[PDB]
Design a protein around this ligand. Structure first.
Ligand SMILES: Nc1ncnc2c1ncn2[C@@H]1O[C@H](COP(=O)(O)OP(=O)(O)O)[C@@H](O)[C@H]1O
Ligand SMILES: Nc1ncnc2c1ncn2[C@@H]1O[C@H](COP(=O)(O)OP(=O)(O)O)[C@@H](O)[C@H]1O
Ligand SMILES: [Mg+2]
Ligand SMILES: [Mg+2]
Lengths: 475, 475
C-alpha cells in the first residue's frame, strides 16, 4: 500500500463536518441510509456502463450491498460491488464536494437549518472512516484507499483488491455501541431499504461446530419502487425513496406515481419537495428528472422533461419510447421528449391541484417555498394557463396580513355588485401596497384588493389578462 | 287602393295559428313584446344598408318605435320608421313562414310544447291585423298594404305611404279592452323595452283648449344591452334579450357576458337554449351568433365564430377588429375571425362548466338536449380535450337507467383501491348491452363500467383516452 498522500479539505468542509455533526446527532441513524443510497447509485452506474461494454461484470453480475460489524473492533462495514472508483475519482468525489454551502454557513432539539451532505453523514457516528475501492474494469493493483479522521485532512494511497466495488469501514465513536447490535442495525437497514432495488444482505454468524459459519441473509425485498403497484407501496417507502433520488434530508409534500400504456409508454414518479434547495437561484444548479429506460438507469439531472417554471420538481421517468442509447444531445432534439415533457407538465399541475384541496397547510408550505418559480410560469406556457392561475396564491385585503393565503377563486367568491374586475396593486414591500396607495377608493365601497409585492408580479400580469371571466385591472 | 289581391295561407299556417291562440292565451301580453322586437330588427336592417348608402335615412334619421291606442275604435297601433318592406318582401315574410314539422295530431292547462311566435302572435289578442309599410329608397307610391283576419287568407295592395317604415294596427278581440288602458299598456312596453336599444315611445293625447296636442315620450332607456355593465343588468333582461336575438319563447339554461379588451377587443354574450330547436338535425338549419361591428348590426346566423361541436350556442358578438364591410365571405379567410372562434370556443366551455356546478339539473337538461353534439367534439378540438371530457356524461353500472346521470369526475370520486380505471362498454341501445359479457367479473369486484349506447360513443372514445389521472379502456 504505497502512494500515501494527504490533502486538506476545502476551507468550507471543516465548517460543514464539525457543524453538521452536532446538528444531526438527533437523526444519526442517517449515515446508514446515506451509504446504502450510495451503494445503490454505484450499482446503477455499473449497469449503465455495462450496456456499452458487458464485460465490466467480469465474473459476478449480481449487485448487492453487505453490512457487518466487529463487536470487538467497534466497526461497521458496508460493501457493495458497483462501479467502484478510480483514484482520480476518489479525489474528486470523496476528496471534495461538487455542490455548495458557504454563503449560508456563516448564519443561523433537532437543529438542522438546511441539510448537510450524504457521504460525510458517516462522521456523525464514526471518528475514522476507511474506503477501499477498485474501479470497474480496471486492474486489481490500482485499488484505492481513503482514510480520514474527518478532523481536517484525509489520505489516499494505491492498493490491491481482487474483488470489485467499494468497502467502507467506520470506526465508531464511543457511545455508538448501538450499531454493533444485530436487532438495532438489522432494524435500521430494514427501515432504510425497501425503496432500494439493490439487494441488501447483512452478515449472519452462527457457530455450527468445527470452525465458524458465516452467511449473508438479505433483509431487502429488492424491487425498483416505481415498478410495484401504488396499492401496496406505503407512504414511508414513498418518502424515503424521494430522499434517495433527491439527495435531501427533508420529506416531500406529495407524489404522483403513474403508469401509462398507449402512444407514450412510460411510468413517471414525480415529487414535490418541502424546502427549496439552497442553491436554487444561481445559473449552474442541478434540476431535472432522474431518467430511466427499460428500468435501466441512464442519466441524472435531465432537465429536458420539465419546462423551466417547474425546475423545482423531482423524480424519475421509466420511459420505453426512448432509445436505450439516449444521449444528452439526442434528447434535446427529440420529439418523444417534447411529448413526454408536456405530458408531464400537466401531471405536476394535476398533482398540485389535488394537493391544494387535500391539505392546504401543506400547500401553503409549497406556495412559500416555490412561489416565485410558478409565477414566471404563465409567461411562456399559456397552454395550461387556467390550472396555473388557480394554483397561484396572493395577499388580499380580506386578510390583515402579508400571508399569501388567498386563491383567485377565493377572490371571486367574495366579489359583490359593481364587479367585472379583480383589482391589484404592484408595489415593492407588502407595506408599500397595503397602505401606501389609493386602494381606499375601493375600501370605501367594500371591494377586495390583491396586494402583490413580489419582484416578478408586474411582468407576470402582462400575460395573465383575465381569470375565468373577471378581467384583471391595476389601481 | 289599387293592386288589391287576396291570397291564401300555406296549409300549416291556418293550423299553426289556431293552435297558437289557445296555447299562449296564458301570456297574451306576449305579442306586444314581439312587435317592438321586430321593430327593433327593422331599425338594425336600415342602419346596415344605411352604411353602404346613407341616402336611405333620407332626412329622418332618428329611429324609434311608437305605440298608441284608440278607445272608441278599439285598436292598438305600433309603427316604426325602420327599413320597411316592399310588395315582394311583404308576401314572402308575412304571408308565409319558414318553421315546420308536421303534427296538429293533438286535436279532435296550457299547451306550449315547442313553438315559434313572431308576427302572428298578434292574433292571440287581435281579431284583425293591418299593415301599411313603405321600404327605404322607394317612391311613397310604392307603399304596401296587408290585412288579414288570421282565418285563412290575407289581402295585399298598393298604397301611398309618404312615411318610411311600418305601421301595424291591431283591432282587439272583444274582451281585450285591457290594452286600451294607458297604465297596463305603458307597463307592458316598459317591461319589454328596456333590453332594447331602439327608443320606444308611447303616444299621449291631451285637451289643450279646443285643440288636441299629440305628445310622444320615450319609456325606454334605449341602450344596447351588451353595452351596459354586467352589474346593472337584471337576470330578467338577460333572458328577454335572449328571446329577442334567439327568436325563442323559452328561457335559456344560462349565459355568459364578457367584455374582452387587449389584443382582441370585443364584447361577447352567449347563451345555451333550454331546448334544441325543433328543426335542429338537418344540415340546412341556421346556427350562429348575431354579429355586430362597432356597435352596428351587420348579420345574423354567422357560423364562423363557433365550431360544429358547439353549433347550438346562441348569442351575439360586437367587435372592433373587423371592418364595417365583413360579409359571409371575408369571415371565411379572416384571421381576426378564427382567433375569436377560438377565444370564444374556449368561453362557451367555461360557461358550460360553471353550469354543471351551480345547478346540476339544468346541466342534465342541457346534456339530454345537446349532449349528442358535444360528443362530436374531442374528435375536432384537441386543444380543449380537458374541459370537454370534464363535461360529457354517460350511463353507468351503478345507475338504474339509460339515463346519462354519471359524470367522469364522480366516477373517480366513486373509484376505489382496485386500480387505474374508467372502463367503458359498446353495443346498441341500453338494451343489448347492459346484459352482455365480461361485465360480470368487473362486477364481482364492485367496479363500475360506463355503458355506451349512442351511435357515436365508440368513435368519440378513440379521441378521448385520458381524463385526468386515471387512464381509459374497453371491456
Ligand atoms: N459506494 C460508492 N461507490 C461509488 N461511488 C461512490 C460511492 N459512495 C460515494 N460515491 C461517490 O461519492 C459522490 C458523492 O457522494 P455523496 O456525498 O453521497 O453525494 P452524492 O452521492 O449525492 O453525489 C457520489 O457522486 C459518488 O461519485
Ligand atoms: N315591423 C317590421 N318591419 C319590417 N319587417 C318586418 C317587421 N315585422 C316583421 N318583419 C319581417 O317579417 C318577418 C316576420 O316576423 P317574425 O314572425 O318575427 O319572424 P322573425 O322572428 O324572423 O322576426 C321578419 O322576419 C321580418 O323579415
Ligand atoms: Mg448520495
Ligand atoms: Mg321576431
Amino acid at each position: 500500500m504505497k502512494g500515501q498522500e494527504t490533502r486538506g479539505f476545502q476551507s468550507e468542509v471543516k465548517q460543514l463536518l464539525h457543524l453538521m455533526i452536532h446538528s444531526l446527532y438527533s437523526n444519526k441513524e442517517i449515515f446508514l441510509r446515506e451509504l446504502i443510497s450510495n451503494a445503490s447509485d454505484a450499482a446503477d452506474k455499473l449497469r449503465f456502463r455495462a450496456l456499452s461494454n458487458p464485460d465490466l461484470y467480469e465474473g459476478d453480475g449480481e449487485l448487492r450491498v453487505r453490512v457487518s460489524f466487529d463487536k470487538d473492533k467497534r466497526t461497521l462495514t458496508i460493501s457493495d460491488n458497483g462501479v467502484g472508483m478510480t483514484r482520480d475519482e476518489v479525489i474528486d468525489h470523496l476528496g471534495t464536494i461538487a455542490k455548495s454551502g458557504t454563503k449560508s454557513f456563516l448564519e443561523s432539539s433537532q437543529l438542522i437549518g438546511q441539510f448537510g451532505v450524504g457521504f460525510y453523514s458517516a462522521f456523525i457516528v464514526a471518528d475514522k472512516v476507511t474506503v477501499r475501492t477498485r474501479a470497474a474494469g480496471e486492474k486489481p493493483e490500482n485499488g484505492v484507499f481513503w482514510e480520514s479522521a474527518g478532523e481536517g485532512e484525509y489520505t489516499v494511497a494505491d492498493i490491491t483488491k481482487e474483488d470489485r466495488g467499494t468497502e467502507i469501514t467506520l470506526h465508531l465513536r464511543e457511545g455508538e455501541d448501538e450499531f454493533l447490535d444485530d436487532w438495532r442495525v438489522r432494524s435500521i437497514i430494514s427501515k432504510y431499504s425497501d425503496h432500494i432495488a439493490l439487494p441488501v444482505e447483512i452478515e449472519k454468524r452462527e457457530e455450527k461446530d468445527g470452525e465458524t459459519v458465516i452467511s449473508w441473509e438479505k433483509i431487502n425485498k429488492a424491487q425498483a419502487l416505481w415498478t410495484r403497484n401504488k396499492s401496496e407501496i406505503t407512504d414511508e417507502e414513498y418518502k424515503e425513496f424521494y430522499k434517495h433520488i433527491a439527495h435531501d434530508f427533508n420529506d416531500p409534500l406529495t407524489w404522483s406515481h403513474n403508469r401509462v400504456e398507449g402512444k407514450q409508454e412510460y411510468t413517471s414518479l414525480l415529487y414535490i419537495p418541502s424546502q427549496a434547495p439552497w442553491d436554487m437561484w444561481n445559473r449552474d444548479h442541478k434540476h431535472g428528472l432522474k431518467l430511466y429506460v427499460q428500468r435501466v438507469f441512464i442519466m441524472d439531472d435531465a432537465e429536458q422533461f420539465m419546462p423551466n417554471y417547474l425546475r423545482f420538481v423531482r423524480g424519475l421517468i421509466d420511459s420505453s419510447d426512448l432509445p436505450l442509447n439516449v444521449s444528452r444531445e439526442i434528447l434535446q432534439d427529440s420529439t418523444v421528449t417534447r411529448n413526454l415533457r408536456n405530458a408531464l407538465t400537466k401531471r405536476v399541475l394535476q398533482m398540485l391541484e389535488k394537493l391544494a384541496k387535500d391539505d392546504a397547510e401543506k400547500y401553503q408550505t409549497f406556495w412559500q417555498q416555490f412561489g416565485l418559480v410558478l409565477k414566471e410560469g404563465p409567461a411562456e406556457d399559456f397552454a395550461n394557463q387556467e390550472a396555473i392561475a388557480k394554483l397561484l396564491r396572493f395577499a388580499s385585503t380580506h386578510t390583515d396580513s402579508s400571508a399569501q393565503t388567498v386563491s383567485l377563486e377565493d377572490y371571486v367568491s367574495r366579489m359583490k355588485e359593481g364587479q367585472e374586475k379583480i383589482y391589484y396593486i404592484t408595489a415593492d414591500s407588502y407595506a408599500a401596497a397595503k397602505s401606501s396607495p389609493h386602494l381606499e377608493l375601493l375600501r370605501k365601497k367594500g371591494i377586495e384588493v390583491l396586494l402583490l409585492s413580489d419582484r416578478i408580479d408586474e411582468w407576470m400580469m402582462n400575460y395573465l389578462t383575465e381569470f375565468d371571466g373577471k378581467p384583471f385591472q391595476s389601481v
